[PDB]
C-alpha cells in the first residue's frame, strides 16, 4: 500500500508479509497476541481495572557465544535460525505480581520453518531452560518437518563410468570423480566432502565415490538425531512443567510428533497436523487418494480423535485459550495451585438438580444452567468450567473448574447418548460412513482412554486436585481392558487430592466402581456418595436373576398372574441394598452427602486437604523410613487439642494462620530424623563412622 | 478304594476343580516342580536332582495378620484364595531362587473375590514386593462375590395400595414387631435400617436400607477389588509379575490379568468382564453362544492381552518358568547369565540378502538348513518370543547373547495378513483381511513396541536390543502410540542397543523414535556397513532435489530412463553408515558377521559399568550420572583403552572387591562433605545436632 496513516509493518519487515501469505501470524507478532489475551483476561475479571504497560513484558531469548540463553532486544527478522523464543512475564488475575513462561516457535518464513540441527538444539536449550525454572513451555508450531537436502557442490563434478560409454542405455558401473573434480573441492576447503578411493582405469586416474557426506550441515541423519533429541526433551518436559502447543500453520513430521509429545494441544482450523504430506502418500499407494492435507491432519480428524484438545478459529483465539488454560496452573512447578476468588461465593446451595425423570447435561450440574426463570447455579463457580478434549469420546466430560476459587480438574459422565460418526476411508472405494451409538454411563475403549489421559494431564504439569462425578454402570467395546488399566495407573501416580463423588440419580456398578475406589491411592483419594445415589456389584435386574429366581420368588409368593408385581418386589428388595447407608455401614465411603450442600462441604474439605498436603510435602526430603501415613498423624498431633480434626473449616483455618510456625515444627521434624539417622549409622558401623565425625573438626 | 493312598478329603475338591476345567489349587505346586525338573533335563540331561531342589511352603496369615509359611495339610483353606512361597534351584540360579504363587481356589464359593480373599491377595502381593521376588498369579474365578441379606428374605412384609389384591402395587417393605425381635435373638438386629411407624393399630418398621449380617454382599467387595487392582498396578512396576489364566477369569479377575501385564492363557479358558448370558440380556436376542467369543484366546491372544497361549496348565507353568529364566532372582539383582554350548566367540552364519525373503527370526536365533545350521545373532535355542499373536509386524521376545539375557525387538519384513472376525453384535458387519506391509509402523505395532520396552524394563530389568528396520507408517492413532515408545525409552534403566541390520534401513520418523539422544544414559546406535538411513529414501529424495530440470541439466556426461537411475544412486550415496559416522549419529558401523562378538563384549562391559554406577545410588550429595561414570572410569588403569570393551570388562571383573573398597571410600567422603556443607548452610542448627549426637 502507498501512503498509509502509519508505517506499513509488512514492508518494514517483508517476512511479516510472507508469514501472512502462509496464513499464519508472523512469529515476532505473537508476543503482542499474548498481551491482548492477557489484557482481555483482566477485562473479564474486573473491568474497572486499568492496566499499565509494564503489566506485560516479553524478552526474546537467544544463545550467546557460550551457547547459553540470554535476553536480547533486536529488530524482528534478525533471527539467524528458524526457531525463536520469548520469556514472558505477565501480571494476571491469579498472579497479580506476575508469572512467567516461555514461548518457543518455528519461524515459518525461515526455510519454511524446517527443523535443522540448530533449530533442534535451540528448541532443546529453551525446553531445558523452562524446566530448570519450573516454568511453563508454550510451543507455537508452524513448520515443514526435518530439513533435507543433498550435497549440491557435488552435482557438477561426479562422473559416470558406464559399461560402454557408447551405450548409456546399457546401464553404468559406479560414480567417480576426476583429478580435476578433486581439485575443485580442495579449492573450496570442502576436501572432506566425499569419501573416495583412487583407481586407474584404462589409463586415466579415477576417484570412485564411496560415500557422499556434504559440506552443508542439515542434509540427513543429523536432522534425525536432532529430532530424536527434542522428542525426548518434550517427553520429559510433560512430566516436569506445564506444556501446551498451538498449531498455527501446518505441523509436519517431528512437528506433528511434538504436538502429541507435549500432550496439550490447540489446533487452529485449516492448519493440519501431518506425519507426511498427502502428495507423498499418493505417489506411494497408487492414484490421487487424498485431495488435501486437511483429510489427513485436519481438525475433523485430530480434534475428533483426541490429539487436539481444542479447536481455535484463529491465532488470537488459540492464544486466548492457552492463557485461559494457564490460569488454573501454578506459576511454576510445585507452587500451590492458583486460588482465584470470583463473585460466586463458596457459601451457597447448589440450585440445578438432576431428576430420575428428565434427561440433563452433566455440564449443568458442573457449571450451572441458564434459564428463563433465571440462572441455576451448579457445583462449581459460575463461568469457571473450561472443557477440553470436547471433540473426542464425548461419553465422558473433561475440564478445569473452580470451587470457591480453588482450581481443579473435573471429570463427569455424559448421560445422553453419543452419535460418533466416522467418515469413509479415501484409500478404499469399498467403504461408507459409520454411525456409532455410544450409550451413556457406559465405558468404551475411547471413554476409558480419555478418562486416563485427563487424570494424567491434571497430574503432570498442571498439578491440580481432582473431582470425578462417578456415574458409570458398565463397559462395552476387547481393548477396554487395556485402557481401563491405564486409569488405575494414572490414579496410582496422582499427587494432589482426589475426590470421587457419585451424584444424585447416579450409580456406580461392579467394574465401574473398581477403577475409582479410594484404596487404589489411599494417600490422595476419598470417596463420597449422594444420599440419592446407587451402588453395587450388579444392578437390581442382574441381582434378581441370580439371587431371586422364579424358584424362591414363589416361596415368598406363598407366605403372602401376580408375577409382574412380584417382580417389582424382588427389585425393591435388591435396590434397598444399593444405598449410601449401606456404603457408610460397610465403610467404603468417607461420607454420604446432600447434593444441595455439596458445594459447601467440598469447598472446605478440599481446602483443608490442600493445606495438609502442603505440610506433608514439606517432609519429602526427610531422612528415615517414615511413611506418609505416619507423617500426617504427626502433623495432626500438632493441632490444638480443642480443634476438631473432623472440622474441615476449622483445621484449614488454624493451618492458614500458622504456616511459618508449622514450617518450624516441620524443620525440627527433619532435624530429629537427620540425627536419629546419624545415630543408627554409628550403631551400624561405629568404626568408619566414629572416625568420620572426627574427620569433621572445623 | 484307589491304587495308591491319596488324601481322602481332597477327592471332592479335586473333582469340582476338574469339573470346572482347571487343576486343583494345591496340586499346582507339583506342576511347578515338574516344570523345574524338566528345566534341568533340557539344560543338562546328565543331572540328578534331590527333592531339596524344590520346596513349596504354603503362606497364611498369623495371629497378627502377618504372612507366615506353614506345614499344614492341603485343602484346609478358610478363604477362596491361597498362596505358596517357592524356593527352587534352577540352571541360572543353582543355589536357588524364590517367588510367590497366589491363586484363587475355584472350589471355594466358585473362586469369587470377597473382602477376605482381596485382603489376602493384597497382603501376598505386598509380601513379594517387599522382598523383590516374582509374583505369579493363577487366575480361576467368578469375579467379585455378590450377595443379599437372606435372613430378611423369610421375614419381610409388603404394604400394598388399595389392593387386598397386590395386582395394583405396593408402598414399601416393613418388619413386624416379632420379625424385628427375631433378629434380636439372632443378634442380627443391625441387619437393617428401619423406622417405627404404627399405622392402623399395627406398628410397621419401614425398611429404609438393608445391610445384611453376611459380609461380602456388595460394595465392600468392590472396595476389595479396587485395592488389589491398584496393588497389582504397583507390583508391575516393582517386581516381575505374570498371570496364568487357568480357568475363567471374571471382572476384577480379568482386570488383574491386564494389570499384571504378562499373561499366559490356557486354551478354552476365557478372560471376561461380564458373561455372555448377561450381555445377551442387554441386546435382546441370543447373540453370543459362549464366553469364548468374548474372551477366548482368539480374542485376547490376537488383541495383545494374552502374551502367550498354552494347551494345558502344565504347559502354562512351563512357559512361566521358561520366562522367569531370563529374569533376576529378585529386584535389582544382576540379570541371570546362563552360558550354553553356543559360546560368544563365533561369527554369525545366517545373513539376509537384498534379493530374497527372510524371517527376522533367522537373524535372531539362526536357521535350520539341509546342509546344517546357520547360527543367528543370539544363542541357539534361546529366543523366547511373546505377544506373537498380535501386531505381527514387530517381533518381540527374550534371548541370550553368549549367555547374557536381554529383550529383543525385530521387524517382520514379510507382509501380514491381519484377519479381523465379524462381531455377532452387528450382522451388518462381516469379516475383513487387513493388510500390513512390513517395515511399516502401524498403530498396533507401535503399541506393541512400547509395551515390549516397558515389559523388558519393569520387573524383568533387562537390557535390550532393537534391530531397527522401519521406513513408513499408516493406519491419528500412530501419533499417540508412537509417543508411547518415546516415553518408554526415556524410562529405560538398562543398556539399550539400537542396531540397523544388513539390508535394513531407518528413515524419517522411524529413526526419531529410536534415536540415542532420547535417553543418552542408556542408548547407543549402530549401523551395519550394508544399512541405509536418511530423512527420505532415494525415490522421494530425488523427486525434490533432482527434478526434470536438474536431471536434464546434468547432461554434461533424451534418455530419461537410464539417467533416472544415476540420480537415485547419487542420493543413495548419502544414506551410508559412513556418513552416519561422519555426522556422529552412531557410535560406529559394524559388520554383521562380527556383530555377535562385538555386542557380547560391549554389553558385558556396559553391564559391569552400570553395576558400578548403581553402587552410588544411595550416595549422598547430588552428582549427575555422567559425573559418577567419569569418576568410575578415572579409576581404570591409565593403560586401559576405554574403548576396548573386553579389556574394560576384564579389568573390572578382576577388581570388583577392590573397586568396592574404593566405592565405599567415595561414600564416606561425601558423608562428611555433606555434614560440612550442612554447617556451612545452617551453622546454628547443625552444631546443636552435632553436639546432641555425640551422646
Ligand atoms: C465387580 C466386577 O469387578 C470388575 C473390576 C474391574 C473390571 O475391569 C474394568 C473396569 C473398568 C473399566 Cl473402564 C475397564 C475394565 Cl477392564 C471389571 C469388573 C466383577 O468382578 O464382576
Ligand atoms: C524426520 C521426520 O520426523 C518425524 C518424527 C516423528 C514422526 O511421527 C512418528 C514416527 C514414528 C512413530 Cl512409530 C510415531 C510417530 Cl508419531 C514422523 C516424522 C519428518 O520430519 O518428516
Curated annotation (Swiss-Prot), chain A:
UniProt domain CoA carboxyltransferase N-terminal: residue ranges: 5-341
Organism this protein belongs to: Saccharomyces cerevisiae (strain ATCC 204508 / S288c)
Signal sequence residues: none
Gene: ACC1
Subcellular location(s) of the protein: Cytoplasm; Endoplasmic reticulum membrane
Region (Carboxyltransferase): 5-621
Function: Carries out three functions: biotin carboxyl carrier protein, biotin carboxylase and carboxyltransferase. Involved in the synthesis of very-long-chain fatty acid synthesis which is required to maintain a functional nuclear envelope. Required for acylation and vacuolar membrane association of VAC8 which is necessary to maintain a normal morphology of the vacuole.
Entry binding sites for CoA: 250, 547, 549
Source superkingdom: Eukaryota
Induction / repression: Repressed in presence of fatty acids. Repressed 3-fold by lipid precursors, inositol and choline, and also controlled by regulatory factors INO2, INO4 and OPI1.
Domain CoA carboxyltransferase C-terminal, residue spans: 345-621
Subunit structure: Homodimer.
First-to-last residue of the parent protein present: 1482 to 2218 of 2233
Protein's name according to its UniProt entry: Acetyl-CoA carboxylase
Note: Present with 20200 molecules/cell in log phase SD medium.
Residues reported in the UniProt entry to bind acetyl-CoA: 146-148, 511
Taxonomic lineage: Eukaryota, Fungi, Dikarya, Ascomycota, Saccharomycotina
Amino acid at each position: 500500500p502507498i501512503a498509509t496513516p502509519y508505517p506499513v509493518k509488512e514492508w518494514l519487515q517483508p517476512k511479516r508479509y510472507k508469514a501472512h501469505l502462509m496464513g499464519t501470524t508472523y512469529v515476532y507478532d505473537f508476543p503482542e497476541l499474548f498481551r491482548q489475551a492477557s489484557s482481555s483476561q483482566w477485562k473479564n475479571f474486573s473491568a474497572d481495572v486499568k492496566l499499565t504497560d509494564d503489566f506485560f513484558i516479553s524478552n526474546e531469548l537467544i544463545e550467546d557465544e557460550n551457547g547459553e540463553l540470554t535476553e536480547v532486544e533486536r529488530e524482528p527478522g534478525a533471527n539467524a535460525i528458524g526457531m525463536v523464543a520469548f520469556k514472558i512475564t505477565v501480571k494476571t488475575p491469579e498472579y497479580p505480581r506476575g508469572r512467567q513462561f516461555v514461548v518457543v516457535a518455528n519461524d515459518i518464513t525461515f526455510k519454511i520453518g524446517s527443523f535443522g540441527p540448530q533449530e533442534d538444539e535451540f528448541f532443546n536449550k529453551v525446553t531445558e531452560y523452562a524446566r530448570k525454572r519450573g516454568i511453563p513451555r508454550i510451543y507455537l508450531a508452524a513448520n515443514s518437518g526435518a530439513r533435507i537436502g543433498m550435497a549440491e557442490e557435488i552435482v557438477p563434478l561426479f562422473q559416470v563410468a558406464w559399461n560402454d560409454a557408447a551405450n548409456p542405455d546399457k546401464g553404468f558401473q559406479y560414480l567417480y570423480l576426476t583429478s580435476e573434480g578433486m581439485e575443485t573441492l580442495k579449492k573450496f576447503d570442502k576436501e572432506n566432502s566425499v569419501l573416495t578411493e583412487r583407481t586407474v582405469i584404462n589409463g586415466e586416474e579415477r576417484f570412485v565415490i564411496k560415500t557422499i557426506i556434504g559440506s552443508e550441515d542439515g542434509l540427513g541423519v543429523e536432522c534425525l538425531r536432532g529430532s530424536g533429541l527434542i522428542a525426548g526433551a518434550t517427553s520429559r518436559a510433560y512430566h516436569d512443567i506445564f506444556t501446551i502447543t498451538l498449531v498455527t500453520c501446518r505441523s509436519v513430521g517431528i512437528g506433528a510428533y511434538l504436538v502429541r509429545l507435549g500432550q496439550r494441544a490447540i489446533q487452529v482450523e485449516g492448519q493440519p497436523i501431518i506425519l507426511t504430506g498427502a502428495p507423498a502418500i499418493n505417489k506411494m499407494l497408487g492414484r490421487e487418494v487424498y485431495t488435501s492435507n486437511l483429510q489427513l491432519g485436519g481438525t475433523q480428524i485430530m480434534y475428533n480423535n483426541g490429539v487436539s484438545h481444542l479447536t481455535a478459529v484463529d491465532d488470537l483465539a488459540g492464544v486466548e485459550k492457552i492463557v485461559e488454560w494457564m490460569s488454573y496452573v501454578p506459576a511454576k512447578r510445585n507452587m500451590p495451585v492458583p486460588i482465584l476468588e470470583t463473585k460466586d461465593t463458596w457459601d451457597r446451595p447448589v440450585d440445578f438438580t438432576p431428576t430420575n425423570d428428565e434427561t440433563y447435561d452433566v455440564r449443568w450440574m458442573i457449571e450451572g444452567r441458564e434459564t428463563e426463570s433465571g440462572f441455576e447455579y451448579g457445583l462449581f463457580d459460575k463461568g469457571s468450567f473450561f472443557e477440553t478434549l470436547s471433540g473426542w469420546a464425548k461419553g465422558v466430560v473433561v475440564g478445569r473448574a473452580r470451587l470457591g476459587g480453588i482450581p481443579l480438574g473435573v471429570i463427569g459422565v455424559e448421560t445422553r447418548t453419543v452419535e460418533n460418526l466416522i467418515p469413509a476411508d479415501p484409500a478404499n472405494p469399498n467403504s461408507a460412513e459409520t454411525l456409532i451409538q455410544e450409550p451413556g454411563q457406559v465405558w468404551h475403549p475411547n471413554s476409558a482412554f480419555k478418562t486416563a489421559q485427563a487424570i494424567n494431564d491434571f497430574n503432570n504439569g498442571e498439578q491440580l486436585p481432582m473431582m470425578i462425578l462417578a456415574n458409570w454402570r458398565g463397559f462395552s467395546g476387547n481393548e477396554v481392558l487395556k485402557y481401563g488399566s491405564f486409569i488405575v495407573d494414572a490414579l496410582v501416580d496422582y499427587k494432589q487430592p482426589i475426590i470421587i463423588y457419585i451424584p444424585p440419580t447416579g450409580e456406580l456398578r461392579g467394574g465401574s466402581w473398581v477403577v475409582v475406589d479410594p484404596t487404589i491411592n489411599a494417600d490422595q483419594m476419598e470417596m463420597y456418595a449422594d444420599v440419592n445415589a446407587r451402588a453395587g456389584v450388579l444392578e437390581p435386574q442382574g441381582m434378581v436373576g441370580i439371587k431371586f429366581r422364579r424358584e424362591k420368588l414363589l416361596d415368598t409368593m406363598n407366605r403372602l398372574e401376580l408375577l409382574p408385581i412380584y417382580g417389582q418386589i424382588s427389585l425393591q428388595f435388591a435396590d434397598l441394598h444399593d444405598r449410601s447407608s449401606r456404603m457408610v455401614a460397610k465403610g467404603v465411603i468417607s461420607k454420604e452427602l446432600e447434593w444441595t450442600e455439596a458445594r459447601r462441604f467440598f469447598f472446605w474439605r478440599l481446602r483443608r486437604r490442600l493445606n495438609e498436603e502442603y505440610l506433608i510435602k514439606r517432609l519429602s526430603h526427610q531422612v528415615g523410613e517414615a511413611s506418609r501415613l505416619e507423617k500426617i498423624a504427626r502433623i495432626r498431633s500438632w493441632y490444638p487439642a480443642s480443634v476438631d480434626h473432623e472440622d474441615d473449616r476449622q483445621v484449614a483455618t488454624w493451618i492458614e494462620e500458622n504456616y511459618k510456625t508449622l514450617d518450624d515444627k516441620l524443620k525440627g521434624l527433619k532435624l530429629e530424623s537427620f540425627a536419629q539417622d546419624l545415630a543408627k549409622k554409628i550403631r551400624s558401623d561405629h568404626d568408619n563412622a566414629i572416625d568420620g565425625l572426627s574427620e569433621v573438626i572445623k
